Short mmCIF file of C-alpha atoms and ligand atoms in Angstrom, two decimals:
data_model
loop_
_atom_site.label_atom_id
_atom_site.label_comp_id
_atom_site.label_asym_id
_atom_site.label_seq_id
_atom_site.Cartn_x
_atom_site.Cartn_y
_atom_site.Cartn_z
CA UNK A 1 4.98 -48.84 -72.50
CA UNK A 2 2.10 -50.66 -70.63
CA UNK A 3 2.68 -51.98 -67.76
CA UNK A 4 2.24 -55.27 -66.73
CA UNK A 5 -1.09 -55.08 -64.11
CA UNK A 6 -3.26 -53.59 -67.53
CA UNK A 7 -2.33 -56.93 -69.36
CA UNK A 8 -4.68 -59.88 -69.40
CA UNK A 9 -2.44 -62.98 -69.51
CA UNK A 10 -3.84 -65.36 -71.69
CA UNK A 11 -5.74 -63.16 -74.25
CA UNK A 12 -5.26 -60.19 -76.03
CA UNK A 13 -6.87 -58.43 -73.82
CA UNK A 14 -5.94 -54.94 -72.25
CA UNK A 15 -7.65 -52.71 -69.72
CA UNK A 16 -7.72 -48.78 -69.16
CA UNK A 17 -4.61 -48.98 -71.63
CA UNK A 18 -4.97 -46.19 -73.88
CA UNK A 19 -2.09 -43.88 -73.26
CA UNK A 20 1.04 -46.73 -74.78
CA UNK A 21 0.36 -46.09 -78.70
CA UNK A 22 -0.73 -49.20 -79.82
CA UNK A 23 -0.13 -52.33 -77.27
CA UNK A 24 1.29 -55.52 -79.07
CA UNK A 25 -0.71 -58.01 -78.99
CA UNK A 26 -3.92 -55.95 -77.70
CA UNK A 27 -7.13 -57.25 -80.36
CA UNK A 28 -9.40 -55.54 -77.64
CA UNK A 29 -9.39 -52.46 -75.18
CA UNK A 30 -11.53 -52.51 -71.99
CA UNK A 31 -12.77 -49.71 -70.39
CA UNK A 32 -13.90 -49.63 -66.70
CA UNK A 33 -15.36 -46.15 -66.53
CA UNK A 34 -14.98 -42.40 -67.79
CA UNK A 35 -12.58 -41.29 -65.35
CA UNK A 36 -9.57 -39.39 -66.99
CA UNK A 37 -6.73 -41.48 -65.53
CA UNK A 38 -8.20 -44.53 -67.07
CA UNK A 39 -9.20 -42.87 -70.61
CA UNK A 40 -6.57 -41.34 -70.92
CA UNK A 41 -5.25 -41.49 -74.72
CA UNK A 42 -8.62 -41.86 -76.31
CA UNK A 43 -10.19 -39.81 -79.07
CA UNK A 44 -12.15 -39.69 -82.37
CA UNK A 45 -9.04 -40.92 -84.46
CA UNK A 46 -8.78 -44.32 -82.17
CA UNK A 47 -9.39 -47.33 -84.37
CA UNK A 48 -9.06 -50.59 -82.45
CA UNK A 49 -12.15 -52.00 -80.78
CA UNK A 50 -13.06 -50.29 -77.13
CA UNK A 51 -15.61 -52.64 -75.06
CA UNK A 52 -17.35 -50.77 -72.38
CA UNK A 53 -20.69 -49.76 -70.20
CA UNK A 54 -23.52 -48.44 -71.99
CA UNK A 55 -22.97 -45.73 -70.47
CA UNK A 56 -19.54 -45.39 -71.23
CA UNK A 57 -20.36 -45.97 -74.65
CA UNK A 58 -22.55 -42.53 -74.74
CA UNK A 59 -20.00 -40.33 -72.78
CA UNK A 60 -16.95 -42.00 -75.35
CA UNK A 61 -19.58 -40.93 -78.56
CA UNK A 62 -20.71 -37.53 -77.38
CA UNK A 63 -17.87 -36.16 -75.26
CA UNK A 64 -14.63 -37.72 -76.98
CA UNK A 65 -16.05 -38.33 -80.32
CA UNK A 66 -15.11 -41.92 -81.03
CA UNK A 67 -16.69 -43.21 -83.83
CA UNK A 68 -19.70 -45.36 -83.11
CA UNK A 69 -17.70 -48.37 -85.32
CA UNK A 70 -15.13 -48.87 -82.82
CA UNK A 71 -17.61 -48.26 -79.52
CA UNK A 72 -18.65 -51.94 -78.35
CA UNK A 73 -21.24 -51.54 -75.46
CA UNK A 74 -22.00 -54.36 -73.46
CA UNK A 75 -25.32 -55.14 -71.10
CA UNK A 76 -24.46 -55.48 -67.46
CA UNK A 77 -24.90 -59.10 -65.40
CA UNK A 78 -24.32 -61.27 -68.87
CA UNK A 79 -22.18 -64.06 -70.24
CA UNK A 80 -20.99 -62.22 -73.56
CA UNK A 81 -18.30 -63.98 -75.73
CA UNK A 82 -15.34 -61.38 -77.17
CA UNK A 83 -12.81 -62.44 -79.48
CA UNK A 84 -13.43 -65.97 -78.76
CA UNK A 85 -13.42 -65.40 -74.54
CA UNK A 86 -16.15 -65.18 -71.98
CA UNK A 87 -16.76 -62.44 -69.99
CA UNK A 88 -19.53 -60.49 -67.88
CA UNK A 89 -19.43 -56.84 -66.74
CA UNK A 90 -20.42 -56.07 -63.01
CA UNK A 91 -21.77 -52.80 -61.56
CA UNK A 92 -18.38 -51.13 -59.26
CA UNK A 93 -20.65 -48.87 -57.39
CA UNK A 94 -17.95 -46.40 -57.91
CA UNK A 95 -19.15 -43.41 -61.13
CA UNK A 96 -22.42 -44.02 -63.61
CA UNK A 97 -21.27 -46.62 -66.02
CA UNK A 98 -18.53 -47.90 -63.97
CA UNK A 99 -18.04 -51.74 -64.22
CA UNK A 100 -15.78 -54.94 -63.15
CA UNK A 101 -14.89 -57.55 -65.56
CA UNK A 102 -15.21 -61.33 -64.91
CA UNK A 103 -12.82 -62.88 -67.47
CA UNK A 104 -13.29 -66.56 -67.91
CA UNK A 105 -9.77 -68.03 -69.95
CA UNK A 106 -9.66 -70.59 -71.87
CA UNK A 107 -7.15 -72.63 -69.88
CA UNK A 108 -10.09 -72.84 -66.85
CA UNK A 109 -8.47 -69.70 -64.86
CA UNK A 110 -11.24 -66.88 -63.94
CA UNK A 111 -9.90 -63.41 -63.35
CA UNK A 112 -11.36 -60.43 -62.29
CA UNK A 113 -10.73 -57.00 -62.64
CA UNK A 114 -12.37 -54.94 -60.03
CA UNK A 115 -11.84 -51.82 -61.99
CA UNK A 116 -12.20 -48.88 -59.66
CA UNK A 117 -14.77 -50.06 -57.09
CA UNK A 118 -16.21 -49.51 -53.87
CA UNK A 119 -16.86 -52.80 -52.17
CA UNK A 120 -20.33 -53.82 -50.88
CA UNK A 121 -22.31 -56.83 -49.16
CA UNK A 122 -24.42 -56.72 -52.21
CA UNK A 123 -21.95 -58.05 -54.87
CA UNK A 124 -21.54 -61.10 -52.61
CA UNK A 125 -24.85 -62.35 -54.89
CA UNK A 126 -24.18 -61.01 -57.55
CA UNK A 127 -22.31 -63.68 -60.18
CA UNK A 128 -19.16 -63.47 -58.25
CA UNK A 129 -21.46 -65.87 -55.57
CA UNK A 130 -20.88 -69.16 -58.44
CA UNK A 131 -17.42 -69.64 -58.90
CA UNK A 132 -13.97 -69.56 -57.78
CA UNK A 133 -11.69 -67.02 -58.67
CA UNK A 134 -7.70 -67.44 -59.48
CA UNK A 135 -6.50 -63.72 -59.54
CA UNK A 136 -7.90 -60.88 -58.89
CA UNK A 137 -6.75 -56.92 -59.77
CA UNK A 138 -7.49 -54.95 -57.16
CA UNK A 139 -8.24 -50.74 -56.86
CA UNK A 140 -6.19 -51.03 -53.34
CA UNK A 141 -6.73 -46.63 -53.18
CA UNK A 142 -7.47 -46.84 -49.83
CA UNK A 143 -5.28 -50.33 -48.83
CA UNK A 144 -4.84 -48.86 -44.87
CA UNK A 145 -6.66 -49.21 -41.46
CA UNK A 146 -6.22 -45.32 -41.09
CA UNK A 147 -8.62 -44.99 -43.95
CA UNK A 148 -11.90 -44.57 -42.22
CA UNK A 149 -15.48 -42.58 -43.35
CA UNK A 150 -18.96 -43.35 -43.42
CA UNK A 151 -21.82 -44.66 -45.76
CA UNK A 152 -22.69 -42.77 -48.37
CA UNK A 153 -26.31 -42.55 -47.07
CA UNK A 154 -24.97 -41.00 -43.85
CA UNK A 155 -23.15 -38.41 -45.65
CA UNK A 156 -26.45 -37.18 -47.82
CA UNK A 157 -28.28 -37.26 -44.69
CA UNK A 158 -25.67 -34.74 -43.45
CA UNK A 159 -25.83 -32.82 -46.63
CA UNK A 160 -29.60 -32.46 -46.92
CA UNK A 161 -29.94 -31.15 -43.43
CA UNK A 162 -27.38 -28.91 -43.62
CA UNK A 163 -28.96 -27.06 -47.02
CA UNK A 164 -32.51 -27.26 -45.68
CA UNK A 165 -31.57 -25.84 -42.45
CA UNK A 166 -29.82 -23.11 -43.87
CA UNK A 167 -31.99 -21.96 -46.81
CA UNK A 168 -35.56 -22.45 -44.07
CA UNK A 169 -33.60 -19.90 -42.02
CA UNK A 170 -32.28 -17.11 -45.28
CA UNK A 171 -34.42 -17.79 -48.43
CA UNK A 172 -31.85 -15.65 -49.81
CA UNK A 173 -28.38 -18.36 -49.91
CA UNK A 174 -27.35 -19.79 -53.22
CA UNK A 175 -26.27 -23.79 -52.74
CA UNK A 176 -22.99 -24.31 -54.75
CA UNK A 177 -21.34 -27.54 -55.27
CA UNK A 178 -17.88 -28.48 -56.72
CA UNK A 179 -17.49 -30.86 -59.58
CA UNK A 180 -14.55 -32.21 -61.65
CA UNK A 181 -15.62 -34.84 -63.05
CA UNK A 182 -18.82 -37.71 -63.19
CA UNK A 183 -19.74 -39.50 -60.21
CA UNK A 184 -21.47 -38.34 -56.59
CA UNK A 185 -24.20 -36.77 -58.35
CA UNK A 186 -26.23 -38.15 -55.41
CA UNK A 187 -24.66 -34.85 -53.39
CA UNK A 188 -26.49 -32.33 -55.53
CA UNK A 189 -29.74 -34.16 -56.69
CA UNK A 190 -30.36 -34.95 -52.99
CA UNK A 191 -29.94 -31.48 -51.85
CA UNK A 192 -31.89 -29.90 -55.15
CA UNK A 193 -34.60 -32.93 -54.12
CA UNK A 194 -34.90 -31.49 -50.43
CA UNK A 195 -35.26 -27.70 -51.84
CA UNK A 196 -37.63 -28.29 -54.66
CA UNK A 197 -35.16 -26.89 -57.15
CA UNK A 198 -33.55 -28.01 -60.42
CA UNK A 199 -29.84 -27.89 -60.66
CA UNK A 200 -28.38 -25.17 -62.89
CA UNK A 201 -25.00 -25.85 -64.60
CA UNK A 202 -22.80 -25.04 -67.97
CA UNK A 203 -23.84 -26.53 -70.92
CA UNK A 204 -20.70 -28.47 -71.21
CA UNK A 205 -22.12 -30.14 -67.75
CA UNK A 206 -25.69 -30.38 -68.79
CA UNK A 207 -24.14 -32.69 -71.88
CA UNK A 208 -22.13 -34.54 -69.60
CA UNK A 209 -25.32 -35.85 -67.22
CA UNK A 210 -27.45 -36.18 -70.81
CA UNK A 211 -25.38 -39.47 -71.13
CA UNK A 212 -25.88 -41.26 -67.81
CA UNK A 213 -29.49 -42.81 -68.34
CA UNK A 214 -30.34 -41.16 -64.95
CA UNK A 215 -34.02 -41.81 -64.75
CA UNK A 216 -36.21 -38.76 -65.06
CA UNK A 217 -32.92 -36.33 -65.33
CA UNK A 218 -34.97 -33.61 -67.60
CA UNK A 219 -36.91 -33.18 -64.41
CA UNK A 220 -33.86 -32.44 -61.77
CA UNK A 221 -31.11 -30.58 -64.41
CA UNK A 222 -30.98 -27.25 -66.51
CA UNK A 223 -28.59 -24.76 -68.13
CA UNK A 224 -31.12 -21.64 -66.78
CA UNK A 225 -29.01 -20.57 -64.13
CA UNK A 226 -31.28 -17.72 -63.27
CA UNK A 227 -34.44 -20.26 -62.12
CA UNK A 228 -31.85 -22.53 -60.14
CA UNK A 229 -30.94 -21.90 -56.74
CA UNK A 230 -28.40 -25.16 -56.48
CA UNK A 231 -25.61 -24.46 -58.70
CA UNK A 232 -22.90 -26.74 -59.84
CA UNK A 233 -18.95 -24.91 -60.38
CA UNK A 234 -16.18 -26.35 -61.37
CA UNK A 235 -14.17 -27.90 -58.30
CA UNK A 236 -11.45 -25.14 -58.49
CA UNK A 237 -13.61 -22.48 -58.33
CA UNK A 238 -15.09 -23.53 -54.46
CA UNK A 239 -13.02 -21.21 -52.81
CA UNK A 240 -13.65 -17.67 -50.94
CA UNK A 241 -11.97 -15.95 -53.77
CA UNK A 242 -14.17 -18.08 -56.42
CA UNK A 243 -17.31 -17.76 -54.63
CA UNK A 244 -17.19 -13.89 -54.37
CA UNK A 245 -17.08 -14.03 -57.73
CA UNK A 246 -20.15 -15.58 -58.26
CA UNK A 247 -21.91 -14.03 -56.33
CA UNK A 248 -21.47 -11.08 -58.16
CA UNK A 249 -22.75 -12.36 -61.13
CA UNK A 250 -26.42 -13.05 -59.49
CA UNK A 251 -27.37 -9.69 -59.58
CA UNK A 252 -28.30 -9.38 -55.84
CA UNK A 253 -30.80 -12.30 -56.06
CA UNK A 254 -28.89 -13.63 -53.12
CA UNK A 255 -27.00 -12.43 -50.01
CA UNK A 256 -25.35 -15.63 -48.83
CA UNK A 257 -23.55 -18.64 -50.51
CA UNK A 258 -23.51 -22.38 -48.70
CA UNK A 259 -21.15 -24.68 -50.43
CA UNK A 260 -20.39 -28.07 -50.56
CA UNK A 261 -16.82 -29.95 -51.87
CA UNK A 262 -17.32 -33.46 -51.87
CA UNK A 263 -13.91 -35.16 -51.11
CA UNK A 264 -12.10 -38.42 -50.99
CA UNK A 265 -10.67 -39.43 -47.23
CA UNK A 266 -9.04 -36.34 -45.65
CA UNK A 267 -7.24 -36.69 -42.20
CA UNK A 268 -9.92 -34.80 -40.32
CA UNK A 269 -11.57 -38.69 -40.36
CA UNK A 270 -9.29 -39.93 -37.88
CA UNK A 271 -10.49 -37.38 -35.14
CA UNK A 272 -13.95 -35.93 -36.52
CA UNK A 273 -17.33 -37.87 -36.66
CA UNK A 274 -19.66 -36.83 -39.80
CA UNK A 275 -22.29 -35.44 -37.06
CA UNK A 276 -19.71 -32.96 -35.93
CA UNK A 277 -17.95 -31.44 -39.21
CA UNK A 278 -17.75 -27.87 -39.69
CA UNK A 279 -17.46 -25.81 -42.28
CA UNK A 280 -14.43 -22.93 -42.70
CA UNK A 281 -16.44 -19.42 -43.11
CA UNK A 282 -15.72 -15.60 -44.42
CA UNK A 283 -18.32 -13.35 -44.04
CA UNK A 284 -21.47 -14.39 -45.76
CA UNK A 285 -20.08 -17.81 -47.33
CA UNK A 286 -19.02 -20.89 -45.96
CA UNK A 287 -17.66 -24.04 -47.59
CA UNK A 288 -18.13 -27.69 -46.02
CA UNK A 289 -15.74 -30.51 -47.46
CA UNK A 290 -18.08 -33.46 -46.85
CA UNK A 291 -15.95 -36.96 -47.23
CA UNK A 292 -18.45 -38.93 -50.02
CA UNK A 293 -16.16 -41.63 -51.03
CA UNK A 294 -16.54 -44.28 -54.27
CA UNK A 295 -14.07 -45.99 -53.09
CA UNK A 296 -13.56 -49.20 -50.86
CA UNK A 297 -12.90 -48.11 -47.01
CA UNK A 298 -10.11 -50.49 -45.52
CA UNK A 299 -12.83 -52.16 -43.96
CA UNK A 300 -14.92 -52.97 -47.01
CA UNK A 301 -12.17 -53.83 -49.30
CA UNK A 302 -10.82 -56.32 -46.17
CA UNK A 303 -14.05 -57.79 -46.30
CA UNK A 304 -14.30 -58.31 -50.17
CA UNK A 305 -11.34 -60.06 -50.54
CA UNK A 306 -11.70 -62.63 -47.03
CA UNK A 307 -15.18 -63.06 -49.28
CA UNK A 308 -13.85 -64.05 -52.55
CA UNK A 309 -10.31 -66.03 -51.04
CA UNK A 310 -8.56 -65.38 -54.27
CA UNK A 311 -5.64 -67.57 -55.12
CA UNK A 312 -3.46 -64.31 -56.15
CA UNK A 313 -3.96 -60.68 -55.47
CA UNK A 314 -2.34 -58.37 -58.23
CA UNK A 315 -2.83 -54.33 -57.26
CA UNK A 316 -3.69 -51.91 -59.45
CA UNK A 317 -3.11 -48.43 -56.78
CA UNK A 318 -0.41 -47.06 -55.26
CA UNK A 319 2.15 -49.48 -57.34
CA UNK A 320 4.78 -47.01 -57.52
CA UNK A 321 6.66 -47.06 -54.25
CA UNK A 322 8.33 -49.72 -52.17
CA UNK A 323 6.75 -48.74 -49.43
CA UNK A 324 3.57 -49.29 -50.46
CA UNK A 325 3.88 -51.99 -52.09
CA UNK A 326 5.27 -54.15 -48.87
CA UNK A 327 2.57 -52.46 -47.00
CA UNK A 328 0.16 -53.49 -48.79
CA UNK A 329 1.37 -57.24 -49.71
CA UNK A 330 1.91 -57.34 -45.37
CA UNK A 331 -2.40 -56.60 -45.13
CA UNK A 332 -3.22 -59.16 -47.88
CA UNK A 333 -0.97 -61.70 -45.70
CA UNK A 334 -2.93 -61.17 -42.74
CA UNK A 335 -6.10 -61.34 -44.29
CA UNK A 336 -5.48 -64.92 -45.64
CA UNK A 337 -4.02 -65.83 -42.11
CA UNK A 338 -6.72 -64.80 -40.31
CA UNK A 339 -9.74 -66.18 -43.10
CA UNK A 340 -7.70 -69.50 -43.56
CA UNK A 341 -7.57 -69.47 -47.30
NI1 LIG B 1 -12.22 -43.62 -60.97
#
């Protein structure tokens, strides 16, 4: 049974509600982004109209197989009337394709739906910047001060360094980096960028980046393993036992493996600055976990919301304790005291 935070009031409107059967009432699905926990339920025997990202659109086609009838794409940054209601999608800078949705009731109540999101300066001019808005539903994943890390530009910088120092010094390392899913491609183009490689990966990968519109993509990607030396593995194979492994399967064309498992927040970003991380090491590998976020710091999200003064706050993470919940409604509070809203 859905619950209540993926219903729309007012419209028959759902969002990232695919895993309940059919919803009563529901005469159209949104989806944010491609992200399993939001998909989940979708397939090529769905039959109810799915409105989505361009982007979206492709990976929902060509990776789930949903028939192209049912696939409603929408164009980013424009008033767009479905079923009757006004809405506009707005870039999350969270994954490729990811978007917020601006829904404008017929009653005069505006609602938006951040999706997953991670909060920027930027969307203060975006369309938000012309109108009030009544409630919004918020990706509160990181919803405490503890959760610290830095810019996503300061973490490439990191990351580039780090691969062009060590592959200048051994010509000889393999670059691997984790995946499990789209988003932070920015980690491994950057890096490929810096080395004047392409990045080798599965075919079932290759596919995958094929429907992100990534300008000039058949330049930085390939399924020729052998001409790459920035490879892309599955997330659960970055590991010592995992990386052995493959470096077997190169047939000695290198000696050394630097890898690179881009994580969420981790606790070693209360003590540890970016400049100073580390990387655990066994014999001729090492593996740095490198803390490239797309989603709202504490600090970001705090500033979002004291932005946009909504009238009512409705979260859409970490709903499923008591704890969190109070701890949570005890920051929004605060906010509101200290903005004056
Ligand atoms: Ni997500």
């Amino acid at each position: 049974t859905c619950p209540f935070y993926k219903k729309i009031p007012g419209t028959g409107f759902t969002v990232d509600a695919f895993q309940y059967g059919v919803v009563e009432g529901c005469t159209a699905y949104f989806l944010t982004h491609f992200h399993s926990d939001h998909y989940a339920g979708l397939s090529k025997h769905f039959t109810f109209p799915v409105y989505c990202s361009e982007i979206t659109g492709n990976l929902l086609k060509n990776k789930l197989h949903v028939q192209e009838q049912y696939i409603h794409p929408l164009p980013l940054d424009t008033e767009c009337i479905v079923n009757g209601v006004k809405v506009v999608l707005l870039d999350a800078n969270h994954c490729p394709g990811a978007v917020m949705i601006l829904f404008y009731l017929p009653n005069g109540t505006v609602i938006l739906h951040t999706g997953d999101f991670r909060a920027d300066p930027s969307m203060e001019r975006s369309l938000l910047a012309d109108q009030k808005v009544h409630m919004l539903y918020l990706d509160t994943t990181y919803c405490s001060p503890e959760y610290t890390f830095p810019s996503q530009q300061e973490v490439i910088r990191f990351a580039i360094n780090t691969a062009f120092e060590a592959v200048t010094l051994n010509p000889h390392a393999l670059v691997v980096c984790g995946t499990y899913s789209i988003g932070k491609e920015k980690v491994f183009l950057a890096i490929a960028d810096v080395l004047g490689s392409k990045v080798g990966m599965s075919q079932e990968k290759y596919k995958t980046l094929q429907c992100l519109n990534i300008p000039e993509i058949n330049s930085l990607i390939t399924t020729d393993m052998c001409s790459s030396l920035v490879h892309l593995l599955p997330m659960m194979q970055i590991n010592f036992k995992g990386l052995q492994s493959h470096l077997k399967k190169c047939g000695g064309k290198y000696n050394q493996i630097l890898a690179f498992r881009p994580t969420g927040w981790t606790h070693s970003n209360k003590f540890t600055r970016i400049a100073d991380v580390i990387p655990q090491t066994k014999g001729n590998i090492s593996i740095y976990g490198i803390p490239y976020s797309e989603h709202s710091s504490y600090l970001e999200m705090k500033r979002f919301v004291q932005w946009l003064k909504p009238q009512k706050i409705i979260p859409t993470v970490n709903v499923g304790t008591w704890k969190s919940r109070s701890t949570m409604e005890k920051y929004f509070r605060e906010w509101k005291l200290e903005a004056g809203y």
